[PDB]
Amino acid sequence: EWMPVTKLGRLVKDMKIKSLEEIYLFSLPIKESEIIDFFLGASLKDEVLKIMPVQKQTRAGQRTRFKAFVAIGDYNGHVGLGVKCSKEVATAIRGAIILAKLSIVPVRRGYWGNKIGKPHTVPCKVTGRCGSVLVRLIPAPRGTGIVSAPVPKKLLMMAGIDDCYTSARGCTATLGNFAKATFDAISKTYSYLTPDLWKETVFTKSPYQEFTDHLVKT
């Protein structure tokens, strides 16, 4: 039973907000996982990328705690990645899934050459950076598949990308930084300005302003 605590959840639960791109358009921080469960739900699938034991030295020996990396995606242009450390593996995974849901970003897809059909590749060459790891994504011809390492390929398939060349520099053996550098590159697709997006923006009322009267009485 979803009892929302934020005013975005109280508008999602009341059918007022009827799309995730409506929340993405205004850059509002999403703090409840039931909002993501509301819109994507049956489309979402997750993947455990690694389980990392970490240790903290104490007077009476070590202190062990386990870290979990979880990727999530709907294979249709949404992808997220979450990491969580906890004393038990089951709790770590359960808590990392929530974070992965809360990190979900949209992905922009483009065309390599001629524009027939749905977009299939990245719109342009994009680079992601994370602690000595560099990941470069290059558009690829239709039907080539994902030419990449097994770690970024999972996140690239979660995001709906079909074709892409990849390059990687730095210590990629640390998959915690290798996965956070490809996630960073995917996030940049809706940050790169192209002549497609040169039109002046029309400003629509934010949901907080549009449903003021509903929020006051609820």
């Binding site: 993947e47 455990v48 389980i51 034991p53 062990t64 386990f66 038990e88 593996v89 089951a90 995974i93």
Partner: peptide, 30 residues
């Protein structure tokens, strides 16, 4: 009612059988 991969990994992550308990836990998860 078999063995629990979670318990196996948590108890043998630093022993000789760590590489096997990781594989079994990954099989259970995915």
């Amino acid at each position: 009612l078999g063995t629990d991969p979670y318990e196996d990994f948590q108890e043998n992550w630093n022993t000789k059988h760590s590489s096997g308990v990781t594989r079994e836990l990954m099989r259970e998860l995915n």
